[PDB]
Amino acid sequence: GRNEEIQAALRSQNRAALQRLLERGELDPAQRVEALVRLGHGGEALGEALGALGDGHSRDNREQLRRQAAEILERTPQGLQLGWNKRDFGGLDFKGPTLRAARHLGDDWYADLELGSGRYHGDALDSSLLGSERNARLTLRRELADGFAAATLDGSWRDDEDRHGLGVLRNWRLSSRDELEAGLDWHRETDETGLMRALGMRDSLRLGGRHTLSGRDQLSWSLAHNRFSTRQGDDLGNGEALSLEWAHTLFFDGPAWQLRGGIDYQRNRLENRVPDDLLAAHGGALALDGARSQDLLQDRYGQVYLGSTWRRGFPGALNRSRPQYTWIVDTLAGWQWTEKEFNYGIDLGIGMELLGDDELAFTFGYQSAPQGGGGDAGGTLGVTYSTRFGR
Amino acid sequence: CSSFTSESATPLARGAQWGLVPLLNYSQAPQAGERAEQILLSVLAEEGVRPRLYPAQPQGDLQLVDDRERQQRALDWARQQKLAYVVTGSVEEWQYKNGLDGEPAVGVSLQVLEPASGRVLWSTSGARAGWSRESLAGAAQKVLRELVGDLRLE
Amino acid sequence: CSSFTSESATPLARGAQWGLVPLLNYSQAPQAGERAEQILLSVLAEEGVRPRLYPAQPQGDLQLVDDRERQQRALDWARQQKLAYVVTGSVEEWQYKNGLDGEPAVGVSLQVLEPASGRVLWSTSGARAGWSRESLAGAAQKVLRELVGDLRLE
Amino acid sequence: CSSFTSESATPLARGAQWGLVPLLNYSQAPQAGERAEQILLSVLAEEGVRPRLYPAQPQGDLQLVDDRERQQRALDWARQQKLAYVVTGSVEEWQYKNGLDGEPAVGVSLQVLEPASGRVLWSTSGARAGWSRESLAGAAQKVLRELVGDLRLE
Amino acid sequence: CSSFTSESATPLARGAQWGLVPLLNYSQAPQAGERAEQILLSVLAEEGVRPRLYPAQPQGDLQLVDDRERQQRALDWARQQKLAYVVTGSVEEWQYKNGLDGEPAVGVSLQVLEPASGRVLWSTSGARAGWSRESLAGAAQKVLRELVGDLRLE
Amino acid sequence: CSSFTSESATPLARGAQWGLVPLLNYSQAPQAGERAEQILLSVLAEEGVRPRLYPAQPQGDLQLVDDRERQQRALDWARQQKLAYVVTGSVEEWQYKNGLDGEPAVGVSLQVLEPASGRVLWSTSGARAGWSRESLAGAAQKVLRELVGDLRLE
Amino acid sequence: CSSFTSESATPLARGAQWGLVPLLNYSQAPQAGERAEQILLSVLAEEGVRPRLYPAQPQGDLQLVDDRERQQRALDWARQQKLAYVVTGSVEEWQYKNGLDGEPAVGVSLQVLEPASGRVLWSTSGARAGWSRESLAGAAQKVLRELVGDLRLE
Amino acid sequence: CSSFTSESATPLARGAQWGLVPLLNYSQAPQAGERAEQILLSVLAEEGVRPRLYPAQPQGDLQLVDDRERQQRALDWARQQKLAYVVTGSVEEWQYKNGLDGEPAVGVSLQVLEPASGRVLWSTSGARAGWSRESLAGAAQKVLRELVGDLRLE
Amino acid sequence: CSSFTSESATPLARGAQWGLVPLLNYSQAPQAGERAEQILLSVLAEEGVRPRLYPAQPQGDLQLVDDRERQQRALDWARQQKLAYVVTGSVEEWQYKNGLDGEPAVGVSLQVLEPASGRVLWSTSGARAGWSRESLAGAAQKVLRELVGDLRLE
Amino acid sequence: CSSFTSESATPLARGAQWGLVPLLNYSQAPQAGERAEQILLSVLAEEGVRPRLYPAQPQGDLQLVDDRERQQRALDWARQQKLAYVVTGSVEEWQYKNGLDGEPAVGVSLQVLEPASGRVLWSTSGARAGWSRESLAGAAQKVLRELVGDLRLE
């Protein structure tokens, strides 16, 4: 037959056969979109999918087109988002508005702009010197035949000291079941501790991979070597970080139910003493008394956790991928053997479509033992309104 | 999201001899007129109206598919039996949309005619884009309830 | 999400000779009328009602013979056998939706007639769009239970 | 995104004998003219206008039948009947826009003609696309209401 | 995710001459009635019931022989053998979901008939949409176990 | 994830003349009954049962030959000899499931018949949805081992 | 991820006249039986068993020449030659898992028949779903090594 | 991922007059036997063996001619030439596995026969896969080198 | 991203008897020449040039009349009319490049000839790949405005 | 990312009566030989060589063109014209590699023949997979410049 050969070409990843079938215009719209995804053109895939989802075509073509468009929008959303976020790191938080925009600037280039202002309200910080933090991050992602390459330009202008960082990432796909990722970081934002987030940068060389051990099981690992310095360019200590996670899916949707279990370990060689300029006494912004080097960066950190997630799409995402509303219930139980403390956390969220092709999302997060919190509980609070670019 | 036309007509008598003529399926969903008629018989019964259904006839030819022909062939029937009122109408939309939400979209128009003269005494149109978690039959039932609900009966 | 019509008629009599006439299939799912018939036989039995089923009179080409005509033959049979009531109706929706949730969607109308005259003594329509984890037969059973559950019997 | 023309003509008289002639479907959606005619009859009734409907005579092969010719036959009918005004029009767009939005897009032109001369006494057109949560029938109803509402009947 | 109807009939006698005729396949899955019968024979054996199976009726053209025609030709055999009871049923759903999880969905009705008169003594319906890692046969086994387990045999 | 029925019958004698007759393939996987029998023969060999296999017979078009016909001839052959017991069964499911996981799903019924009378002495049904990295043949082997394991022999 | 049955039979003698007859291919993979035969030849030679091979003969028609027909002819040949044992078997699975980068899944049964009587002396089944980077031939070789490895030779 | 069988037979003599006959292609890849024969000829010469090739014949009707009978004709040629050893074998797998890595999978069985009697003097099977950045011909060459390398030559 | 040639010929008098003959469509978009001609007529009139349009040729065979031959016949007409100048051109590109941006790509060549001698007094080519949110008609308008603007009109 | 063979022959004479017979097209790109011929003619002129082109011959069936025989015929033409040298060659690869960022891959072999006897005086091969943002014609031009550049001429 002919349709049988088309299906065989689609299944076997015969790039030449897909190219021929696509040029000669003998594929259905869903088959065309599938071939476009297989051949590496994601933007043209999205365009052809969104331009064919109408009454003119037949049943199950509309279904496959809708599903493919939704999954592509999940991977590479197009739209604008306004929101306000509160992240408590434990005794220290960072509030402020955010603005995220993303779109395909051409068929093979994806742009992601994320602007955000904010302020630090923390007991251990002199927030007067740490004025309003204006953050702007541009990420140009180039799609490749066997993965993608991305370059990020993020900057954080502040009265204390401006930070200008650059990051390059290259993701490889060895097979449908294996992916590898290598990336270089230079003067980038941190999240290890609230103090490090507010007063620190990171130069890091990172390796990682994601492996599909079965249809419902995925294994993810990451190896990193990080160098930490203050925003003024004074060393805080280097180290290596290891992460490993196993995710088991019980239901893929309706709602999606996933169980995860993983282990995170970090070992760092801290400097003998924190730089004096950072201390509040010497015209610095570290209001913590004593200011032991562990507070900025822990020499040893470890945790093994089990988690369960129930979700309908992703509330707070740039594009809503489910009909008319989304929600997430994510729970994590952790055992920090380095701190002899059990970490419990829940992440809640809900989204709703207001005017059409949009989403007003509210997200809440709680975490009893944030890393570097020192016994103080962390959490997250956010509200976002997202609108989608597309027909 | 729904839209309904509100009529400025005189209220119609509750206690009366009502008929029920088949509806016109101007939507491209097959058999949607019959589903609308069944849900309309149920919805009218909720308001104390029990119309007399038109007796069906054999269909052995392809020319007996025009809904207008059947509707006239039933209007004359209503004339013979001397009914006071005759409920009919048309189905404008009967489908799930093809967007991300895929909500049910129903559009139905309802008419009440005088069988002898054939004059239109009532005419209302209702449309609804329901919830993505709502069924098509449920959306049609809601639209028909609001159309029959606003019907002025005394 | 579900919706049901609330009939405003008089209670019927449980202790009577109930018939069961085939249900019309206005949905596009094949043999959905038969599935509704079986689940309705099970659901009525749960409420102390045991209808007498309808004899074969085996039909010819199924796709050519009209559903309404088989139903009319069934009402004729019920008229000869001196049945008190006949439960019948139609199926409006019987399918899993094609959206991103794929939930079951069922819409059915239930009608109780007097076999001789044919007057509609009861008419309720129910619709449901269930959970993604729910089966089509389960949703149909739920809708039929609610319709029969609201049936007023004495 | 909606746009409506504003005519500069003198107003028409509500207290006159109106007619209703079929709308010309220049959109590629089949049977959109009849759907627009039903929603227009409902919308006119909201304004207090009760047009006399053309008589629907049978035609030949339904595949090849021109809309202008049927409209002309109905104009001669209205001219025979001494109708002061005749409401008619056309559909330029009747569809959901392609994409995940499921966006209805309706474009309708409304014309009022003096049957004797055939002269156009009124002519306005409207369009509406940018509302993804509503249905096609709802959008058509809103457009027709805006057109009829701007008719400024006196 | 399952639902079952509860019968309101008198308990039956375990120590009786049970039969077993074909189950009607109103689902779209081929040979679903035979699979359901095999799993039902296994399930009844769990409950201490060993029914006499209908004989293999020789047939040349299976298409001409309807499923419930076969059921009738088996009920006559049950009548000749003077069996006290006979287990009958139908398959309404036998399929995996058309989604990412492909959960099994099964719906089966079970009826116990009196072979001589043909009266229905028991009628229960059960439906299940199981877990993602579940077989169709396992879901059918669970449904049939729940149906047979509610017979309240003596 | 598996499911097995527990026969409530007396154990059968290991030290007897066993036979094996072909399984009935009600699954839509071609030649699944032969694979099931081939694995079942090895599984029975673990427990010390060595049934005599039915002889091969010539045929024409295997598609036109009913499975139950061959099973009946095999039962006739078993009755011709002094076989105390005959192992039989049927395959309900033999496939890799549909969905992103694609795990093996096997469902098999195991029955023991008395060749002289044809009476069923044992009847158990097993089903399994195995690990995604498990093979279909391995899952069938596990199911048949559990079914034969539950066939306690004294 | 593999599974193998463990026979309880008495050891066979390595110092005997062995034979090999073709393997039944109940898998739907073409020519899988011949591949299994070659790999079984290699695996048997590894253990010191050198079976004389059946004489091939081209098939006049593929449909007429069945698998079991050819196997019976080979058994007749082995009977003519007065061999002590005939090692044989069947292929139940020879395929990669559906999708991209699916692992190989091999299911093979191994039998040793007495050529004179034709009774089974040995019967083991093995199944394996291998690594994603593993070949079908390698998985079949591992399965056949384990099956032949467990074969008790003395 | 690779796997090889190790023969227990005695070593063969390099100095004798070796032959080479075409390989049996039980893989579905066209002309894989010829490619394997060419690469095997190259690999044997690396060790020091210089087999004489089997002379080809006119095509005529090779469709009727199967691999086994053609190999038997080659063996007749070999015995006519008085060759001590004949290298032969079969191809079980010759393909790129489905996936995004273009991974080659090769399965080759290598046999050495004695033309005087036809008995197998050596028989090994090798398989290779999982090397994504490797050519199919390279994998075949590596497997054949390993098999020819293990062939103990004095 | 646009590109235009700079013609070095002498200025041409604006106050003369201009003519317009059809453009040659070498782009694969049907009727691109007619659209370009309409837009060029609008653009020329904006600059004060009002060419006499060629007559509508009654072409019995549209396929027979090559655009070059139509242009030649129009040149013959222009010679018959004693026109001072004749404007023509060609369309090299008229399409949306699509992908995701859908930007319009328009390429046209403008020629002014002396009809008596047939010489080319003016020759210029322009190309534009406009913005993503641009229409094809707008891009063609911009290109033709640039080309006609570059004419050195007295 | 290219590779070129370096001839070991003696340089030829730039000043001589050269020819250019057509190139063989062993790639699957239609008319790649002609494109290579034009680019080679341009590249030779850059080096000072100005070959005499062969005369076009009448052509019948274009699908039956045998490049070898036509090249040979051009070689006789060169012989009758008394040309010292003839430049020829072949096109092995002329295509864009599949997928995203498909770079142009061009492979050309250049040969300088002696028409007096047909002896090959020069033979080199070049291949280039160019930059992703490179054209096929540009890659061919670069390959031919390298090939003709290394052609030592004195």
Coordinates of N, CA, C and O in Angstrom, one line a residue, chain J residues 57-119:
Chain J
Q57 N 23.3 16.8 -29.2 CA 22.7 15.8 -30.1 C 21.2 15.7 -30.0 O 20.7 16.0 -28.9
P58 N 20.5 15.4 -31.0 CA 19.0 15.2 -30.8 C 18.7 14.1 -29.9 O 19.4 13.1 -29.8
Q59 N 17.6 14.3 -29.1 CA 17.3 13.4 -28.0 C 15.8 12.9 -28.3 O 15.0 13.7 -28.7
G60 N 15.6 11.6 -28.0 CA 14.3 11.0 -28.1 C 13.6 10.9 -26.8 O 13.1 11.8 -26.2
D61 N 13.7 9.6 -26.2 CA 13.2 9.4 -24.9 C 14.2 9.8 -23.9 O 15.3 9.2 -23.8
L62 N 13.9 10.8 -23.1 CA 14.8 11.3 -22.1 C 15.0 10.4 -20.9 O 16.1 10.4 -20.3
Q63 N 14.1 9.5 -20.7 CA 14.2 8.5 -19.6 C 15.1 7.3 -19.9 O 15.5 6.6 -19.0
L64 N 15.4 7.1 -21.2 CA 16.3 6.1 -21.7 C 17.7 6.5 -22.0 O 18.4 5.8 -22.6
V65 N 18.1 7.7 -21.5 CA 19.4 8.2 -21.8 C 20.4 7.4 -21.0 O 20.3 7.3 -19.7
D66 N 21.4 6.9 -21.7 CA 22.5 6.1 -21.1 C 23.8 7.0 -21.1 O 24.3 7.3 -22.1
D67 N 24.2 7.5 -19.9 CA 25.2 8.5 -19.8 C 26.5 8.0 -20.4 O 27.3 8.8 -21.0
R68 N 26.8 6.7 -20.2 CA 28.1 6.2 -20.7 C 28.2 6.2 -22.2 O 29.2 6.7 -22.7
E69 N 27.2 5.8 -22.9 CA 27.2 5.8 -24.4 C 27.3 7.2 -24.9 O 28.0 7.5 -25.9
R70 N 26.5 8.2 -24.3 CA 26.6 9.5 -24.8 C 27.9 10.1 -24.6 O 28.5 10.9 -25.4
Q71 N 28.5 9.9 -23.4 CA 29.9 10.3 -23.1 C 30.9 9.7 -24.2 O 31.8 10.4 -24.7
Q72 N 30.7 8.5 -24.5 CA 31.6 7.8 -25.5 C 31.4 8.5 -26.8 O 32.4 8.8 -27.5
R73 N 30.2 8.8 -27.2 CA 29.9 9.5 -28.5 C 30.6 10.8 -28.5 O 31.2 11.2 -29.5
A74 N 30.5 11.6 -27.4 CA 31.2 12.8 -27.4 C 32.7 12.6 -27.5 O 33.4 13.5 -28.0
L75 N 33.2 11.5 -27.0 CA 34.6 11.2 -27.1 C 35.0 10.9 -28.5 O 36.1 11.4 -29.0
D76 N 34.2 10.2 -29.3 CA 34.5 10.1 -30.7 C 34.5 11.5 -31.4 O 35.3 11.8 -32.2
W77 N 33.5 12.4 -31.0 CA 33.5 13.7 -31.5 C 34.8 14.4 -31.3 O 35.4 15.1 -32.1
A78 N 35.3 14.3 -30.0 CA 36.6 14.9 -29.7 C 37.7 14.3 -30.6 O 38.6 15.0 -31.0
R79 N 37.6 13.0 -30.9 CA 38.7 12.4 -31.7 C 38.7 12.9 -33.1 O 39.7 13.2 -33.7
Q80 N 37.5 13.0 -33.7 CA 37.4 13.5 -35.1 C 37.9 15.0 -35.2 O 38.4 15.4 -36.2
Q81 N 37.6 15.7 -34.1 CA 38.0 17.1 -34.1 C 39.5 17.3 -33.7 O 40.0 18.5 -33.7
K82 N 40.3 16.3 -33.4 CA 41.7 16.4 -33.1 C 42.0 17.3 -32.0 O 42.6 18.4 -32.1
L83 N 41.4 16.9 -30.8 CA 41.7 17.6 -29.6 C 42.8 16.9 -28.8 O 42.8 15.7 -28.7
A84 N 43.7 17.7 -28.2 CA 44.8 17.1 -27.5 C 44.3 16.4 -26.2 O 44.6 15.3 -25.9
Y85 N 43.4 17.1 -25.5 CA 42.9 16.7 -24.2 C 41.4 16.8 -24.2 O 40.8 17.6 -24.9
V86 N 40.8 16.0 -23.3 CA 39.3 16.1 -23.0 C 39.1 16.0 -21.5 O 39.6 15.1 -20.9
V87 N 38.4 17.0 -21.0 CA 38.0 17.0 -19.6 C 36.7 16.4 -19.5 O 35.7 16.7 -20.2
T88 N 36.5 15.4 -18.5 CA 35.3 14.8 -18.2 C 35.2 14.5 -16.7 O 36.0 15.1 -16.0
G89 N 34.3 13.6 -16.3 CA 34.2 13.3 -14.9 C 32.8 12.7 -14.6 O 32.1 12.3 -15.5
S90 N 32.5 12.6 -13.3 CA 31.3 12.1 -12.9 C 30.8 12.8 -11.6 O 31.6 13.5 -10.9
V91 N 29.5 12.8 -11.4 CA 28.9 13.3 -10.1 C 28.5 12.1 -9.3 O 27.6 11.4 -9.7
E92 N 29.1 11.9 -8.1 CA 28.7 10.9 -7.2 C 27.7 11.3 -6.2 O 26.8 10.5 -5.9
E93 N 27.8 12.5 -5.7 CA 26.9 13.0 -4.7 C 26.5 14.4 -5.1 O 27.4 15.3 -5.4
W94 N 25.2 14.7 -5.1 CA 24.7 16.1 -5.3 C 23.3 16.2 -4.6 O 22.3 15.9 -5.1
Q95 N 23.4 16.6 -3.3 CA 22.2 16.6 -2.5 C 22.4 17.4 -1.3 O 23.5 17.7 -0.9
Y96 N 21.3 17.8 -0.6 CA 21.3 18.3 0.7 C 21.0 17.1 1.7 O 20.1 16.3 1.5
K97 N 21.9 17.0 2.7 CA 21.7 16.0 3.7 C 20.4 16.2 4.5 O 20.0 17.4 4.7
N98 N 19.7 15.1 4.9 CA 18.3 15.3 5.4 C 18.3 15.8 6.8 O 19.3 15.7 7.5
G99 N 17.2 16.5 7.1 CA 17.0 17.0 8.5 C 17.3 18.4 8.6 O 17.6 19.2 7.7
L100 N 17.2 18.9 9.9 CA 17.5 20.2 10.2 C 19.0 20.5 10.0 O 19.9 19.6 10.2
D101 N 19.3 21.7 9.5 CA 20.7 22.1 9.2 C 21.3 21.2 8.2 O 22.5 20.8 8.3
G102 N 20.6 20.8 7.2 CA 21.0 19.9 6.2 C 22.0 20.6 5.3 O 21.7 21.5 4.5
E103 N 23.3 20.3 5.4 CA 24.3 20.9 4.7 C 24.4 20.3 3.2 O 24.0 19.2 3.0
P104 N 25.0 21.1 2.3 CA 25.1 20.5 0.9 C 26.3 19.5 0.9 O 27.4 19.9 1.3
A105 N 26.0 18.4 0.3 CA 27.1 17.3 0.1 C 27.2 17.2 -1.4 O 26.3 16.8 -2.1
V106 N 28.5 17.4 -1.9 CA 28.8 17.3 -3.3 C 30.0 16.4 -3.4 O 31.0 16.6 -2.7
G107 N 30.0 15.4 -4.3 CA 31.1 14.6 -4.6 C 31.3 14.5 -6.1 O 30.4 14.0 -6.8
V108 N 32.4 14.9 -6.6 CA 32.7 14.9 -8.1 C 34.1 14.3 -8.3 O 35.0 14.5 -7.6
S109 N 34.2 13.5 -9.4 CA 35.4 12.9 -9.8 C 35.7 13.5 -11.2 O 34.9 13.5 -12.1
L110 N 36.9 14.1 -11.3 CA 37.4 14.8 -12.6 C 38.4 13.9 -13.3 O 39.3 13.4 -12.6
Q111 N 38.2 13.7 -14.6 CA 39.1 12.9 -15.4 C 39.5 13.7 -16.7 O 38.7 14.3 -17.3
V112 N 40.8 13.6 -17.0 CA 41.3 14.2 -18.2 C 41.8 13.0 -19.1 O 42.7 12.3 -18.8
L113 N 41.1 12.8 -20.2 CA 41.3 11.7 -21.1 C 42.1 12.1 -22.3 O 42.2 13.3 -22.7
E114 N 42.8 11.2 -23.0 CA 43.4 11.4 -24.2 C 42.6 10.8 -25.4 O 42.4 9.6 -25.4
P115 N 41.9 11.7 -26.2 CA 41.0 11.1 -27.2 C 41.6 10.2 -28.2 O 40.9 9.5 -28.9
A116 N 42.9 10.3 -28.5 CA 43.5 9.5 -29.5 C 43.4 8.0 -29.2 O 43.1 7.2 -30.1
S117 N 43.5 7.6 -27.9 CA 43.4 6.2 -27.5 C 42.4 6.0 -26.3 O 42.1 4.9 -26.1
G118 N 41.9 7.1 -25.7 CA 41.1 7.0 -24.6 C 41.7 6.8 -23.2 O 41.1 6.6 -22.2
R119 N 43.1 6.8 -23.2 CA 43.8 6.6 -22.0 C 43.6 7.8 -21.0 O 43.5 8.9 -21.4

